[PDB]
Amino acid sequence: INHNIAALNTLNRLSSNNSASQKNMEKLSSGLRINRAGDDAAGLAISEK
Amino acid sequence: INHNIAALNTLNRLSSNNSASQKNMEKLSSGLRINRAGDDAAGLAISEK
Amino acid sequence: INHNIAALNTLNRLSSNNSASQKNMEKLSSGLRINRAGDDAAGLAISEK
Amino acid sequence: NLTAAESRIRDVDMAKEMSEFTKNNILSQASQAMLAQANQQPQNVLQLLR
Amino acid sequence: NLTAAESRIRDVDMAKEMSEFTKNNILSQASQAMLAQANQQPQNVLQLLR
Amino acid sequence: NLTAAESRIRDVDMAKEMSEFTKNNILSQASQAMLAQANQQPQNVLQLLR
Amino acid sequence: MRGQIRGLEMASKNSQDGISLIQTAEGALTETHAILQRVRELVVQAGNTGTQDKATDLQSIQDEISALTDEIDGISNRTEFNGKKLLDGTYKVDTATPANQKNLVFQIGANATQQISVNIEDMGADALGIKEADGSIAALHSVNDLDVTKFADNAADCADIGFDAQLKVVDEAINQVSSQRVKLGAVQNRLEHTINNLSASGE
Amino acid sequence: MRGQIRGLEMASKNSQDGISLIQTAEGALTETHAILQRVRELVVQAGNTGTQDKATDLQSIQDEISALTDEIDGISNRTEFNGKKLLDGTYKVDTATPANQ
Amino acid sequence: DNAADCADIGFDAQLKVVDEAINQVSSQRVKLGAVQNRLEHTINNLSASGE
Amino acid sequence: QDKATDLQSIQDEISALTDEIDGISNRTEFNGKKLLDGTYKVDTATPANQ
């Protein structure tokens, strides 16, 4: 009951929320939801044209 | 909501009114509505004859 | 009680008031309530005649 | 007469439209303040957690 | 018109994205508190041992 | 005509360039705020430690 | 839920972009309209000059007008919203076969059938017509604007040359573009009411 | 007890969702209402133009209005709360047979 | 080429079948959630029985 | 509204995503065992082969 914390999803939720927050600031600092192409390739290609 | 001012028509209205005012003075200083041929080519050709 | 801000109408009110203000300036800079045809198609067609 | 009617179609009442503008910009600042208040509750949810 | 559509592709709604940010940072603190609670049980396993 | 074309090459639209300036300075303050938020997480890592 | 919500947001986005399209179109129609007003001026002047000034002044007037018509078709060709022709006959109201109308279906809502289509039609030949234009009249009144030397021949008598005829068909072309602009203004209203319904729904 | 309690909680949940439905419906009716106000404006103008402007201006007015009506039925059709038609005749007040309401 | 007309290309058709695929995976997830419930009730019955 | 090439981009994305669908149905394993593929289909022609 101790040798492995059962709260392991909680860790990946922590990583998820941290990475999320990072990407949020990336958008907030840039002023672009499409700042990196991984965001939305479709809207990217559109915005290119 | 910030990375691009929505007030963009306002700029072209500014350019429009400035250019307008310029042409106005052009007429006011010359005393000719037909000062440049771009004004009225028809009335120009008439005034030529 | 936290994972989604309940204040979501407030956002669309923000977009609404901003877009409104934009259109207001559009009129104020142009001197035309009928500047774009989306304003009033009826009064537009009239003003055309 | 015609140009007068034209004007009554097209002519902005800058007074009215600036009262309206002043209003609407203030509604923007208003609702923005409402977000600035709205987002302050989840931190007190953290206070519930700890 | 084109730049408007560009904006509607690219333009962040800083309001939305800051509500989202505030949220997510708080979820970080949240889950961190959840670890801070989670790790407190094995000591009571020691209390079972002694 | 020539000086007009010169101007259309060289002439700043101070209106456009000040909207752009105001924007960019605000983006500086923006991203600075983003750092001011970013650096606040490791302290909650300390809270995980203790 | 999340299906309808995400597609709703994309539907409002879609809507604002459709608005932008029709704003581009109607701006092209604003300048179209401006030219047609100018043509009307030139026809009024032409009507006086038909018995005041000579065939050569009229020739100058039609150099101007025909150039302006060339600019009409130039607008109907060059005007594009992200590359797409807006004004030409490609989105005509009613072909012989309704299947070939190719109508401007836009996405409006988040589910099936939640779509609206429209039509656009402008070119040089925007003069009178029953389904298409016609020959000496109803097309060339806009494409040619006949008064080269032809209002030196008569007042309004010919009814196909005649000044009354030319002018009334110019005014009708103004009415064609008018009604089209009126359509797109209504369309914009429809999409605004739409995005309101969408935003509230999404809430 | 626990039966009534759990079903009660689900009943309040059910209630808030019913609220959300009628809020969607009434928002559609807010824009409906907005259009009808606009129609009224166009009728007022139409009434003056009946002896001031011509049949073609009226034709323009009715291009607008008829388009707006097309938007009325468009609202009554497109407006849905989780896919469900809200405004159309499917939930009419009183059919000939009350069973079909 | 069309709006929804073809009924096999058509946008109404494409979209409704996408939504049905969502319903397929949906119902499957629903199954496995129920399965999990069944095994939880199971392990309860087991634990009590074993006592 | 947009052209065949933008649609081509959209389907580059979508078809890639479908490739990821089958990629999930193939890669997803619980201690090596395929879970999502047709190996555990609902109803074959012969129920014995389910």
Side-chain angles (χ1 to χ4, degrees):
Chain A
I1 60 170
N2 61 3
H3 182 75
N4 187 358
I5 190 165
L8 295 173
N9 192 0
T10 59
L11 296 171
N12 289 318
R13 298 284 76 75
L14 183 62
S15 179
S16 295
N17 291 318
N18 289 318
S19 65
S21 65
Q22 188 274 330
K23 293 180 181 179
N24 295 117
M25 295 182 284
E26 183 177 1
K27 294 182 183 292
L28 292 173
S29 65
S30 66
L32 295 173
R33 293 183 290 113
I34 62 169
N35 189 0
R36 185 179 295 113
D39 293 331
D40 183 359
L44 182 63
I46 297 168
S47 66
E48 291 187 352
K49 182 175 73 175
Chain B
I1 60 170
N2 61 3
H3 182 75
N4 187 358
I5 190 165
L8 295 173
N9 192 0
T10 59
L11 296 172
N12 289 318
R13 298 284 76 75
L14 182 62
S15 179
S16 295
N17 291 318
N18 289 318
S19 65
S21 65
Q22 188 274 330
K23 293 180 181 179
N24 295 117
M25 295 182 284
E26 183 177 1
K27 294 182 183 292
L28 292 173
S29 65
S30 66
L32 295 174
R33 293 183 290 113
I34 62 169
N35 189 0
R36 185 179 295 113
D39 293 331
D40 183 359
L44 182 63
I46 297 168
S47 66
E48 291 187 352
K49 182 175 73 175
Chain C
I1 60 170
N2 61 3
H3 182 75
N4 187 358
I5 190 165
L8 295 173
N9 192 0
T10 59
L11 296 171
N12 289 318
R13 298 284 76 75
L14 183 62
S15 179
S16 295
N17 291 318
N18 289 318
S19 65
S21 65
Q22 188 274 330
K23 293 180 181 179
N24 295 117
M25 295 182 284
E26 183 177 1
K27 294 182 183 292
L28 292 173
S29 65
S30 66
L32 295 173
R33 293 183 290 113
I34 62 169
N35 189 0
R36 185 179 295 113
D39 293 331
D40 183 359
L44 182 63
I46 297 168
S47 66
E48 291 187 353
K49 182 175 73 175
Chain D
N1 290 318
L2 294 174
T3 58
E6 182 181 2
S7 296
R8 290 189 300 273
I9 297 168
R10 67 182 178 181
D11 190 1
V12 176
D13 189 356
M14 296 298 290
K16 292 181 181 179
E17 188 68 22
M18 187 64 203
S19 179
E20 182 61 27
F21 180 74
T22 301
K23 182 174 74 174
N24 290 318
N25 190 0
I26 294 163
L27 295 174
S28 180
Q29 293 185 6
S31 63
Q32 289 192 15
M34 295 298 102
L35 296 172
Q37 297 293 320
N39 59 4
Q40 297 292 319
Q41 295 178 356
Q43 294 79 8
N44 293 314
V45 176
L46 295 173
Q47 296 295 322
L48 294 173
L49 295 173
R50 63 181 293 166
Chain E
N1 290 318
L2 294 174
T3 58
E6 182 181 2
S7 296
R8 290 189 300 273
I9 297 168
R10 67 182 179 181
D11 190 1
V12 176
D13 189 356
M14 296 298 290
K16 292 181 181 179
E17 188 68 22
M18 187 64 203
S19 179
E20 182 61 27
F21 180 74
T22 301
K23 181 174 74 174
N24 290 318
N25 190 0
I26 295 163
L27 295 174
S28 180
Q29 293 185 6
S31 63
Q32 289 192 15
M34 295 298 102
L35 295 172
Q37 297 293 321
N39 59 4
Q40 297 292 319
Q41 295 178 356
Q43 294 79 8
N44 293 314
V45 176
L46 295 173
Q47 296 295 322
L48 294 173
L49 295 174
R50 63 181 293 166
Chain F
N1 290 318
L2 294 174
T3 58
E6 182 181 2
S7 296
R8 290 189 300 273
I9 297 168
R10 67 182 178 181
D11 190 1
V12 176
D13 189 356
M14 296 298 290
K16 292 181 181 179
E17 188 68 22
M18 187 63 203
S19 179
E20 182 61 27
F21 180 74
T22 301
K23 181 174 74 174
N24 290 318
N25 190 0
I26 295 163
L27 295 174
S28 180
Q29 293 185 6
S31 63
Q32 289 192 15
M34 296 298 102
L35 296 172
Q37 297 293 320
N39 59 4
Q40 297 292 319
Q41 295 178 356
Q43 294 79 8
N44 293 314
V45 176
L46 295 173
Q47 296 295 322
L48 294 173
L49 295 173
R50 63 181 293 166
Chain G
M1 295 298 293
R2 292 189 295 273
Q4 184 182 8
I5 296 168
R6 293 181 184 272
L8 187 152
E9 183 65 26
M10 296 298 102
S12 65
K13 184 176 180 180
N14 285 316
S15 296
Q16 294 182 359
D17 298 329
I19 295 170
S20 293
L21 188 151
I22 61 169
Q23 293 186 0
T24 300
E26 191 271 330
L29 296 174
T30 301
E31 293 295 327
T32 301
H33 182 74
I35 296 169
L36 294 174
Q37 296 292 315
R38 181 66 178 171
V39 176
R40 184 176 181 272
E41 293 180 350
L42 295 173
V43 175
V44 175
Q45 293 181 358
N48 192 9
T49 58
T51 62
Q52 183 181 6
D53 294 332
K54 292 181 181 180
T56 61
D57 289 331
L58 294 174
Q59 184 66 42
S60 66
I61 296 168
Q62 295 297 327
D63 294 331
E64 185 170 1
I65 296 167
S66 65
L68 294 174
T69 301
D70 185 75
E71 183 66 25
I72 301 300
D73 288 328
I75 296 165
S76 69
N77 290 316
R78 291 188 297 272
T79 300
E80 292 180 353
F81 182 76
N82 292 318
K84 187 179 288 292
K85 299 293 184 181
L86 295 173
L87 295 174
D88 58 357
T90 58
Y91 293 96
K92 182 175 174 66
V93 177
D94 182 73
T95 61
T97 302
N100 290 318
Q101 294 178 358
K102 293 181 181 179
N103 293 318
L104 292 174
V105 176
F106 293 165
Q107 185 64 41
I108 302 299
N111 298 114
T113 63
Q114 294 176 350
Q115 293 177 349
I116 297 168
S117 68
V118 297
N119 296 112
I120 297 169
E121 184 176 0
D122 283 326
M123 64 178 288
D126 293 335
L128 294 174
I130 62 171
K131 182 64 69 177
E132 294 292 328
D134 198 356
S136 66
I137 62 169
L140 296 176
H141 291 172
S142 65
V143 176
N144 288 327
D145 194 356
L146 295 173
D147 188 5
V148 176
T149 61
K150 293 182 183 292
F151 293 165
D153 295 331
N154 57 0
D157 293 330
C158 288
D160 57 359
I161 295 169
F163 182 78
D164 292 330
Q166 183 64 46
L167 182 62
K168 67 182 181 180
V169 174
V170 175
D171 290 331
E172 184 61 26
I174 297 170
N175 290 318
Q176 296 295 319
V177 65
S178 176
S179 66
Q180 184 65 40
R181 293 179 68 188
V182 174
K183 292 180 182 181
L184 295 174
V187 175
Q188 184 172 358
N189 291 317
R190 293 179 68 188
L191 295 174
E192 292 177 354
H193 295 286
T194 301
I195 297 167
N196 291 316
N197 293 321
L198 294 175
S199 296
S201 296
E203 183 180 356
Chain H
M1 295 298 293
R2 292 189 295 273
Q4 184 182 9
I5 296 168
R6 293 181 184 272
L8 187 152
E9 183 65 26
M10 296 298 102
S12 65
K13 184 176 180 180
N14 284 317
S15 296
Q16 294 182 359
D17 298 329
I19 295 170
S20 293
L21 188 151
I22 62 169
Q23 293 186 0
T24 300
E26 191 271 330
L29 296 174
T30 301
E31 293 295 327
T32 301
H33 182 74
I35 296 169
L36 294 174
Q37 296 292 315
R38 181 66 178 172
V39 176
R40 184 176 181 272
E41 293 180 350
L42 295 173
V43 175
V44 175
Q45 293 181 358
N48 192 9
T49 58
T51 62
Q52 183 181 6
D53 294 332
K54 292 181 181 180
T56 61
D57 289 331
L58 295 174
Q59 184 66 42
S60 66
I61 296 168
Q62 295 297 327
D63 294 331
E64 185 170 1
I65 296 167
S66 66
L68 294 174
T69 301
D70 185 75
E71 183 66 25
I72 301 300
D73 288 328
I75 296 165
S76 69
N77 290 316
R78 291 188 297 272
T79 300
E80 293 180 353
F81 182 76
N82 292 318
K84 187 179 288 292
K85 299 293 184 181
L86 295 173
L87 295 174
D88 58 357
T90 58
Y91 294 96
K92 182 176 174 66
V93 177
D94 182 73
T95 61
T97 302
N100 290 318
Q101 294 178 358
Chain I
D1 295 331
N2 57 0
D5 293 330
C6 288
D8 57 359
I9 295 169
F11 182 78
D12 292 330
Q14 183 64 46
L15 182 62
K16 67 182 181 180
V17 174
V18 175
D19 290 330
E20 184 61 26
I22 297 170
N23 290 318
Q24 296 295 319
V25 65
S26 176
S27 66
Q28 184 65 40
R29 293 179 67 188
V30 174
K31 292 180 182 181
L32 295 174
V35 175
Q36 184 172 358
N37 291 317
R38 293 179 68 188
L39 295 174
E40 292 177 354
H41 295 286
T42 301
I43 297 167
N44 291 316
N45 293 321
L46 294 175
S47 296
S49 295
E51 183 180 356
Chain J
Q1 183 181 6
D2 294 332
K3 292 181 181 180
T5 61
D6 290 331
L7 295 174
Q8 184 66 42
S9 66
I10 296 168
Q11 296 297 327
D12 294 331
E13 185 170 1
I14 296 167
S15 66
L17 294 174
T18 301
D19 185 75
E20 183 66 25
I21 301 300
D22 288 329
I24 296 165
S25 69
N26 290 316
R27 291 188 297 272
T28 300
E29 293 180 353
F30 182 76
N31 292 318
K33 187 179 288 292
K34 299 293 184 181
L35 295 173
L36 295 174
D37 58 357
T39 58
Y40 293 96
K41 182 175 174 67
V42 177
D43 182 73
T44 61
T46 302
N49 290 318
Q50 294 178 358

